[PDB]
From Swiss-Prot:
<keyword id="KW-0753">Steroid metabolism</keyword>
<dbReference type="GO" id="GO:0042759">
    <property type="term" value="P:long-chain fatty acid biosynthetic process"/>
</dbReference>
<dbReference type="GO" id="GO:0020037">
    <property type="term" value="F:heme binding"/>
</dbReference>
<keyword id="KW-0472">Membrane</keyword>
<dbReference type="GO" id="GO:0019373">
    <property type="term" value="P:epoxygenase P450 pathway"/>
</dbReference>
<dbReference type="GO" id="GO:0046456">
    <property type="term" value="P:icosanoid biosynthetic process"/>
</dbReference>
<comment type="function">
    <text>A cytochrome P450 monooxygenase involved in the metabolism of various endogenous substrates, including fatty acids and steroids. Mechanistically, uses molecular oxygen inserting one oxygen atom into a substrate, and reducing the second into a water molecule, with two electrons provided by NADPH via cytochrome P450 reductase (NADPH--hemoprotein reductase). Catalyzes the epoxidation of double bonds of polyunsaturated fatty acids (PUFA). Catalyzes the hydroxylation of carbon-hydrogen bonds.</text>
</comment>
<dbReference type="GO" id="GO:0016712">
    <property type="term" value="F:oxidoreductase activity, acting on paired donors, with incorporation or reduction of molecular oxygen, reduced flavin or flavoprotein as one donor, and incorporation of one atom of oxygen"/>
</dbReference>
<dbReference type="GO" id="GO:0005737">
    <property type="term" value="C:cytoplasm"/>
</dbReference>
<dbReference type="InterPro" id="IPR002401">
    <property type="entry name" value="Cyt_P450_E_grp-I"/>
</dbReference>
<dbReference type="GO" id="GO:0043231">
    <property type="term" value="C:intracellular membrane-bounded organelle"/>
</dbReference>
<dbReference type="InterPro" id="IPR001128">
    <property type="entry name" value="Cyt_P450"/>
</dbReference>
<feature type="binding site" description="axial binding residue">
    <location>
        <position position="408"/>
    </location>
    <ligand>
        <name>heme</name>
    </ligand>
</feature>
<comment type="similarity">
    <text>Belongs to the cytochrome P450 family.</text>
</comment>
<dbReference type="GO" id="GO:0008404">
    <property type="term" value="F:arachidonate 14,15-epoxygenase activity"/>
</dbReference>
<dbReference type="GO" id="GO:0008392">
    <property type="term" value="F:arachidonate epoxygenase activity"/>
</dbReference>
<keyword id="KW-0503">Monooxygenase</keyword>
Length: 463
């Protein structure tokens, strides 16, 4: 049958007993009772939860194809959210994902590499930092721009100026949708009502914000159709139009202008907020543990010097910095339950049978915070990624990107962003707090699965 769970009440399921304030903890509490595989009910739709490395691994990896579905919630439909990569399934997903991974290969869109676009953004980020002239500063915004401009460059070949109103407009919409999408009312509560949309104004705001962004993308597309050069694809859209020309005589086809739009919005969405937030917390953690900072800096000075930019080759000569970046992601656990999965067919799992179409919830927390792979997993300590001689120590428990067939598409892109932005900031600046290090809180604030950092200010002191 289904794995066992705590008894649900007719209709509301186990709903009125979950800590919507911190679902992760709730899951972890239950696991304390029902073990690593347990069942829950969300107003009648069963959801199997997987907790702990073993169960996540043999699910996502060993039965990878079977667990490769994306769980669908009303919201997916309420915000027209299932038409690109993140919220797709079947043929559509496989085709668009696979093509998207090929095109975001470092050298997948022409002679200009992804690393080179990031490298440029690292320089612009540092310039903007300088322009603050060491005065206090809330970097929430700037750190939001950098990644966004990276997605822009990957998709439009254009980067913007931190003050180009056009950019500032896009950011705003992005930021609005993100903040909205992050409300518990929208993520959870509204997904109890499968038929009735209880927040129509909101979904309407979301959709309008989407339309503005799709409409802007469609302008770029036109500009790209007129300037096409079949031997010199320069960005994601180029590649996507070329794949379209190849699918001519393969209709109906997954690749259309509609899907390009939807895929591009997914990319803007997914490639801007999580990185941005990871960087924003990273700076905060570095203010709090300034001996970590000084160690990153000793590595940078010695391996990279100050003449040139950091580049990805340096990361292998910088085991301590790399440990720092890993540990930031492990410690933050920014997507504690990944995104929802669904089984792709009827399956046997351990003692139990899971019927095709059942939502699966992966507790990334339980892997990231394994208190044996990572002693005192709730403390920030880069030593969790270092061996006895201060060499880099990999961990099969390092899944901030999830695992298996759905592993984040931006995994390599996030990794370049973090390493190059962080090392470029710390190459050109020291960090200074207002309040005393040993004072401010670095523990993630969390909501509707939402993980945000407190407000804080700091100064960027030129080196
Ligand atoms: C630190 C930054 C990031 C983290 C921690 C992160 C993490 C994740 C996670 C946990 C998933 C869900 C995997 C699952 O379905 O089980 C995911 C999916 C995804 N991420 Fe990221 N991500 C990050 C940045 C990015 C970036 C920069 C992009 C750029 C394109 C991106 C694009 C995606 C996409 C498209 C998916 C959907 C994959 C699919 O369902 O096939 N992410 N990410
Ligand atoms: C109905 C079509 C209007 C669409 C829309 N475009 C934008 Cl732009 C605005 C700003 O509020 N809006 C309206 C708006 C109205 C109230 C909400 C909202 C805010 C907080 C808590 C619940 C509500 C809500 N949403 N739907 N019903 N009540 C959000 C969007
Ligand atoms: C102006 C456009 C902003 C981005 C955007 N707004 C809308 Cl509505 C969509 C539909 O998915 N999207 C695409 C989307 C894809 C992934 C996310 C995402 C980003 C960081 C952290 C969590 C999520 C998320 N979205 N849903 N569940 N988790 C946000 C937006
Ligand atoms: K209303």
């Amino acid at each position: 049958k289904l794995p066992p769970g705590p008894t649900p009440l007719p209709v509301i399921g186990n709903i009125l007993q979950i800590g919507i304030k911190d679902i992760s903890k709730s899951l972890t509490n239950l696991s304390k009772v029902y073990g690593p595989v347990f069942t829950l009910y969300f107003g009648l739709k069963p959801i199997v939860v997987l907790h702990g490395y073993e169960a996540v691994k043999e699910a996502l990896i060993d039965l990878g194809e079977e667990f490769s579905g994306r769980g669908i919630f009303p919201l997916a439909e309420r915000a027209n959210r299932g038409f690109g990569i993140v919220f797709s399934n079947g043929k559509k997903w496989k085709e668009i994902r696979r093509f998207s991974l090929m095109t975001l290969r470092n050298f997948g869109m022409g002679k200009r590499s992804i690393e080179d676009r990031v490298q440029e953004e690292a320089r612009c980020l540092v310039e903007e930092l300088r322009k603050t002239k060491a005065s206090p500063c809330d970097p929430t915004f700037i750190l939001g721009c950098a990644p966004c401009n990276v997605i822009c460059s990957i998709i439009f070949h254009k980067r913007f100026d931190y003050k180009d109103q056009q950019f500032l407009n896009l950011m705003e919409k992005l930021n609005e949708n993100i903040k909205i999408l992050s409300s518990p009312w929208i993520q959870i509560c509204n997904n109890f009502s499968p038929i009735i949309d209880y927040f129509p104004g909101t979904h309407n705001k979301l959709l309008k914000n989407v339309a503005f962004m799709k409409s802007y993308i469609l302008e770029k597309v036109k500009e790209h159709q007129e300037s096409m050069d079949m031997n010199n694809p320069q960005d994601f859209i180029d590649c996507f139009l070329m794949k379209m020309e190849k699918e001519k005589h393969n209709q109906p086809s997954e690749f259309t202008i509609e899907s390009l739009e939807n895929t591009a919005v997914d990319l803007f969405g997914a490639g801007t907020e999580t990185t941005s937030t990871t960087l924003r917390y990273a700076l905060l953690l570095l203010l709090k543990h300034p001996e970590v900072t000084a160690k990153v800096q000793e590595e940078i000075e010695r391996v990279i010097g100050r003449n040139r930019s950091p580049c990805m080759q340096d990361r292998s000569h910088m085991p301590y910095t790399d440990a720092v970046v890993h540990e930031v992601q492990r410690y933050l656990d920014l997507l504690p339950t990944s995104l929802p999965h669904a089984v792709t067919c009827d399956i046997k799992f351990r003692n139990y049978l899971i019927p095709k179409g059942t939502t699966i919830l992966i507790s990334l927390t339980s892997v990231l915070h394994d208190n044996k792979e990572f002693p005192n997993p709730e403390m920030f300590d880069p030593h969790h990624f270092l061996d006895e001689g201060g060499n880099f120590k990999k961990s099969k428990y390092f899944m901030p990107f999830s695992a298996g067939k759905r592993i984040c598409v931006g995994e390599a892109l996030a990794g370049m962003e973090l390493f190059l932005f962080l090392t470029s900031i710390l190459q050109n600046f020291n960090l200074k707090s207002l309040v005393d290090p040993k004072n401010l809180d670095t523990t993630p604030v969390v909501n509707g699965f939402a993980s945000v950092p407190p407000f804080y200010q700091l100064c960027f002191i030129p080196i």
